[PDB]
Amino acid sequence: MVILGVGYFLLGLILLYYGSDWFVLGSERIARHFNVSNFVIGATVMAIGTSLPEILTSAYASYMHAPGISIGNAIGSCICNIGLVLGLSAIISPIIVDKNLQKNILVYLLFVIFAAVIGIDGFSWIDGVVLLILFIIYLRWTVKNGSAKNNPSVVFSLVLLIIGLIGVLVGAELFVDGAKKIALALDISDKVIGFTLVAFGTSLPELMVSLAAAKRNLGGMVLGNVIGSNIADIGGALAVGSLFMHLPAENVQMAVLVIMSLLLYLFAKYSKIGRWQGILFLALYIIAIASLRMGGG
Ligand SMILES: CCCCCCCC/C=C\CCCCCCCC(=O)OC[C@H](O)CO
Ligand SMILES: CCCCCCCC/C=C\CCCCCCCC(=O)OC[C@H](O)CO
Ligand SMILES: CCCCCCCC/C=C\CCCCCCCC(=O)OC[C@H](O)CO
Ligand SMILES: CCCCCCCC/C=C\CCCCCCCC(=O)OC[C@H](O)CO
Ligand SMILES: CCCCCCCCCCCCCCC
Ligand SMILES: CCCCCCCCCCCCCCC
Ligand SMILES: CCCCCCCCCCCCCCC
Ligand SMILES: [Ca+2]
Ligand SMILES: [Ca+2]
Ligand code: NA
Ligand code: NA
Ligand code: NA
């Protein structure tokens, strides 16, 4: 039982580690095949693939009458993706953002501010429908602007991508299930801590994929994955949750998100996303986890 937990834990870590690199390599190849930028592949295929855990979690939680967990997971993930994921990644591989990606980030910022505003009194199912529609438009707009028989180069590419994605998603699940089994076996299971960590657990794919990308200096892919994941978590995970039940307001977390998103845009536009910017993101992340209410909603 503690043995099984340790086996899942370790296997999960292995699958996350190697799976992330395969997903990155396959995604980079696919980008070249389709003549799109790494940012575009990161913001679309990679972002959505890695946000499948958030979407399922938020949908399930709300369906099970825990809308606090549903929104806690969605917004907590966005904060994790900028504070921790981008923070670490930026230190590993500093990013200078080109003029067109800057505009994509501005659109992201507007979307986040829009979500925060309509969310002041919580999120209804109509809020969800709107955010989902905007999410779809964002994807199509992003692909438009970043764009332009059986081929073994392409097949290998898709295999790498899909197997890598399977690897990170199964890996994250095993890692989390393993941790939970260990905690249970050692009699240190704590529901409040567990729910606090939901958003982190679902963000393990984003974390490992972004670190793998950063190690290969694929800065545009890192940024696309972070920006795209946050949009997927709001227009997808949060939105779907709101379809099952009204989601209670999280005004403090949304304000933290808006502040981090604003900083991300300002750095992108006027500076770079490098070592000191990453240090700041991590510092804000650490302050957030030190001070935000526990329980994940
Ligand atoms: C298309 C590009 C050009 C246009 C860009 C526009 C960007 C707007 C984003 C933030 C400003 C505030 C938007 C505020 C919308 C508030 C709606 C509202 O008050 O809704 C209340 C309802 O209860 C909620 O569920
Ligand atoms: C992805 C590209 C767009 C990124 C974002 C750009 C700004 C969008 C801002 C306003 C238009 C919003 C949709 C049309 C107006 C909806 C107003 C509203 O409040 O919708 C929910 C409703 O309040 C619930 O009761
Ligand atoms: C502190 C080291 C964390 C290490 C990395 C894994 C983080 C994700 C693990 C559980 C989150 C989702 C749990 C949903 C169920 C929680 C059930 C619960 O009570 O778990 C409490 C236990 O304390 C949990 O270790
Ligand atoms: C070969 C293995 C290479 C591994 C490389 C690992 C890099 C890990 C980065 C941070 C660890 C964070 C540990 C604690 C994680 C949960 C933190 C938390 O409090 O999450 C709250 C919320 O759910 C979300 O913000
Ligand atoms: C023009 C290329 C992109 C076309 C639109 C792709 C839309 C993909 C939407 C995925 C949505 C996942 C969450 C659904 C609730
Ligand atoms: C640019 C507007 C951002 C709003 C960001 C989220 C927080 C709104 C906080 C409102 C605080 C007072 C609430 C009274 C119910
Ligand atoms: C490749 C050289 C990397 C040097 C990285 C220094 C990283 C410092 C991270 C500090 C995080 C601080 C959070 C508040 C204490
Ligand atoms: Ca995720
Ligand atoms: Ca609302
Ligand atoms: Na994602
Ligand atoms: Na998450
Ligand atoms: Na995410």
Swiss-Prot record:
Entry GO terms, CC: plasma membrane
Keywords, ordered alphabetically: Cell membrane, Membrane, Transmembrane, Transmembrane helix
InterPro entries: K/Na/Ca-exchanger (IPR004481), NaCa_Exmemb (IPR004837), NCX_ion-bd_dom_sf (IPR044880)
Record field: transmembrane: 3-23, 39-59, 77-97, 106-126, 128-148, 156-176, 192-212, 220-240, 247-267
MF-aspect GO terms: calcium channel activity; calcium, potassium:sodium antiporter activity
A Pfam family this chain is assigned to: Na_Ca_ex
Keyword DNA repair: no
Listed name of the protein: Uncharacterized membrane protein MJ0091
Source organism phylogeny: Archaea, Methanobacteriati, Methanobacteriota, Methanomada group, Methanococci
